Ligand binder design. Structure first.
Ligand code: DCS
Ligand code: DCS
Lengths: 320, 328
């Protein structure tokens, strides 16, 4: 996986913990990969990607990082934190994907942390073409005398996803001589984590089924994205079918549903673990329903990749 | 190893590996002095904090008594209560919380968001009192009413700051000393000093492991005269429980909790802003922000014993930011 430059944002491998009380209530061995407890600013999955993204930015001698997402994007917040830490400027192109006017979505949560990180906020109506909108802003910013480095939506490029290809080795090492996995459940947004884990776990764990619970798209729209990135990563590294469930995001991206919210309550009351309304909560709702519908190929132990997002809870409260 | 009597106390592993001890290059560059950070805010259970270390001993004690209910008290946006209720949830124990509004605010986000929001998620029974005048007697009164229902309650004092709870920061001191060994010659340590458990735990530990290192407690609720004896009583109790003598003088600065506990000040907010924008580290309005403001002004006024490296203990508190936004 090396030969690609990488910074040290995590260092120690993130915890893999048994969930006894959730396993109790579900009657099935459930494990959790705690990528939410990464050391930088309340954590998240994007640290793994930014280790490669910002390492590439320093090689190209950038002084400014530019990315995009929702107002309450964890990715934007993690990007801003890393930038501040390294002395790099940060420009954010943000949108309101749900059209709310609630003070806490507009000003609290991840968006509040952006003000603290001194992030140059740029508002747009819709991210209809993010790659081309970032490119525009990057020209404007470099015209102002800066050296910008564009980071894609969720940092979900072939290089970005290398963080989660590497992440598979951690899982393989932590599970070995302790637990024999059967299934792995992960949230599938911009496909960065899901494609990354697909390539890695194909080689490092043969008899495991990777399930991608979508948060924004249907199977028809998500399949082409996860396949393409998988074949980009495999080609980049000189090296299996994609499995997706799309029932567990109700009205769309960035809107809470009853199943996802109750999943949040479940893992907080039983395990003291904090999920989020947008990603992990919905991803967990699929996991619970997967056992319920016996949608997994067998009744063996399941691993949930906690990708973070907990700071969103403070923005979505009380409602949106 | 003069701290070997620490083995006598039963302990539940909540942290695992030692928390990061990181150098802060940009802040060091700004302040003109080598600054290090002990990251106890990155403990794995429910957004972290200093109280997790203390709960490791207190909850282990609770289980040995066969208790099924943790009862504790604090502010509505207390970090201790939140961490307590998170541990209680993880171990299948009921949690009863006695909460006060300590600043008389009516802001929605202070009353319902932040730490208070997480309390609901952990299924915490909430008891609202008007003022925490006598927290020990109020917690006792509540315990009787809770056990009359049939619960087997274990009372945890404010901030978990008994001699037993404070053992988690004699533990921390040992981590610090090991991590600094032949890597950094420490001169000073800055920590927030609230209910005194962290400060006193660090006081006892550091006196025996890093005797030449100066320890500074930046008060967040009280003056030197009022805070001094609280830290000392714990200091001496902790030492006695570990078969040790503690002769070190406690040091405190009270110039940085502006109008009172839980009320943000200008120097605090700038300390929060400074570390966020320079290091991507998130402080809080109530504790670490004011403790950092004391470190900065301590450097500014030449208040430390010398010019050497300063370790800042990041005790956590960050979830309060969302509660204290936009104002109180
Ligand atoms: C907590 C959390 N979980 C899951 C995801 C989804 O993972 P991938 O992006 O790797 O698929 C994201 C970010 N992703 C969102 C989805 O859209 N844009 C983003 O930044 C996230 O912040
Ligand atoms: C982040 C943080 N720092 C410091 C403290 C105070 O440290 P000691 O209590 O160990 O001195 C607390 C909680 N303590 C407050 C202080 O009073 N009541 C409480 O619950 C806290 O949450």
């Amino acid at each position: 996986l090396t030969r690609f430059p990488r910074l040290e944002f995590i260092g120690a491998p993130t915890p893999l913990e048994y969930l006894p009380r959730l396993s109790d209530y579900l009657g099935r061995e459930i494990y959790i990969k705690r990528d939410d407890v990464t050391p930088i600013a309340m954590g998240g999955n994007k640290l793994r990607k930014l280790e490669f993204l910002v390492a590439d930015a320093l090689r190209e001698g950038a002084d400014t990082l530019i990315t995009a997402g929702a107002i309450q994007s964890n990715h934007v917040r993690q990007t801003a934190a890393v930038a501040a830490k390294l002395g790099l400027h940060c420009v954010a192109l943000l949108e309101n994907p749900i059209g709310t006017t609630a003070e806490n979505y507009l000003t609290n949560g991840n968006r509040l942390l952006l003000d603290l990180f001194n992030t140059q906020i740029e508002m747009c109506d819709a991210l209809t073409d993010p790659d081309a909108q970032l490119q525009t802003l990057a020209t404007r910013i470099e015209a102002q005398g800066f050296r910008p480095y564009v980071i894609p939506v969720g940092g979900s490029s072939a290089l970005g996803a290398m963080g989660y290809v590497e992440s598979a080795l951690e899982i393989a090492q932590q599970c070995e001589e302790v637990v024999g996995l059967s299934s792995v459940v992960v949230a599938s947004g911009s496909a960065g984590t899901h494609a990354g884990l697909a390539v890695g776990l194909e080689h490092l764990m043969p008899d495991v089924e990777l399930i991608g619970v979508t948060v924004s798209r249907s199977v028809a729209e998500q399949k082409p994205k996860v396949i393409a990135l998988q074949q980009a990563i495999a080609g980049q590294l000189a090296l299996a079918d994609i499995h997706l469930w799309d029932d567990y995001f109700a009205p769309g991206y960035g809107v809470p549903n009853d199943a996802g919210m109750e999943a949040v309550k479940l893992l907080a009351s039983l395990e003291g673990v904090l999920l989020d309304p947008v990603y992990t909560g919905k991803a967990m709702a699929g996991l619970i329903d997967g056992i319920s519908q016996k949608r997994f190929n067998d009744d063996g132990p399941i691993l949930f990749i906690h990708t973070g997002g907990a700071p969103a809870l403070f923005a979505y409260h009380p409602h949106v």
